[PDB]
Amino acid sequence: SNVPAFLTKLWTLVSDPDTDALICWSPSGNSFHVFDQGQFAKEVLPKYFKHNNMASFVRQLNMYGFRKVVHIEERDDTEFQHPCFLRGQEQLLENIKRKV
Amino acid sequence: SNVPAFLTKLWTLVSDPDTDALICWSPSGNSFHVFDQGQFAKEVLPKYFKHNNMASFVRQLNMYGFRKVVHIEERDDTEFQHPCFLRGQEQLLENIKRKV
DNA sequence: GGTTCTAGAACC
DNA sequence: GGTTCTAGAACC
């Protein structure tokens, strides 16, 4: 396949029991969460990407069409969502498209 | 004076010995640094602002014309700068202007 | 106005 | 293309 390396890395990042303490799939599998935003940034992002910044990780998620899921009004949790980014459906990452 | 509350809060945030471990003036006084970005976010921002997010703190700094100082190529440090935001010159915060 | 979310554009 | 920096616009 010729899927972008961001998405195969995201898939791996999320899909990793050892990682699940800081970023894991939602129990249904239609979204993924990230806890302790700043530790994840510091302790996980560099092992997959060429930086250590949540800001820059998020920027990609937006560029590939992901949208944050809003938690409405403590709870240091950030969740993201894309229709073709589903736990049972790895072959759907091919269908994701970065906007250029 | 009728200076915006963001800037009086920034001034206080930076200018506080107890805070200086996570955000302090540059030794000359022409800029301010922030260390351990994520802890500052979590442990300081909420005591001055209605959130706990660096992203949203930065956004204001940009809105009031601050510009990040680039550290060029480990070093978990972020520095910001504004010509009318100087340690000896509190009365110059009146001269700062948010773009609208 | 402050906060949050997303995106533009420059620099790699 | 990925990263960084800043800003637009909607929602409060």
From Swiss-Prot, chains A, B:
Post-translational modification: Phosphorylated. Phosphorylated in unstressed cells; this phosphorylation is constitutive and implicated in the repression of HSF1 transcriptional activity. Sumoylated with SUMO1 and SUMO2 upon heat shock in a ERK2-dependent manner.
Outcome of swapping K99R: No change in nuclear stress bodies localization
Modified residues (N6-acetyllysine): K68, K99
Disulphide bonds in the chain: none
Annotated region described as DNA-binding domain, given as residue ranges: 3-100
Record-annotated membrane-spanning stretches: none
Protein location: Nucleus; Cytoplasm; Nucleus, Nucleoplasm; Cytoplasm, Perinuclear region
Protein role: Functions as a stress-inducible and DNA-binding transcription factor that plays a central role in the transcriptional activation of the heat shock response (HSR), leading to the expression of a large class of molecular chaperones, heat shock proteins (HSPs), that protect cells from cellular insult damage. In unstressed cells, is present in a HSP90-containing multichaperone complex that maintains it in a non-DNA-binding inactivated monomeric form.
Protein family: Belongs to the HSF family.
Free-text comment on this protein's domains from its UniProt entry: In unstressed cells, spontaneous homotrimerization is inhibited. Intramolecular interactions between the hydrophobic repeat HR-A/B and HR-C regions are necessary to maintain HSF1 in the inactive, monomeric conformation. Furthermore, intramolecular interactions between the regulatory domain and the nonadjacent transactivation domain prevents transcriptional activation, a process that is relieved upon heat shock.
Protein name per Swiss-Prot or TrEMBL: Heat shock factor protein 1
Organism encoding this protein: Homo sapiens (Human)
Gene designation: HSF1
Shown residues in whole-protein numbering: 13 to 119 of 529
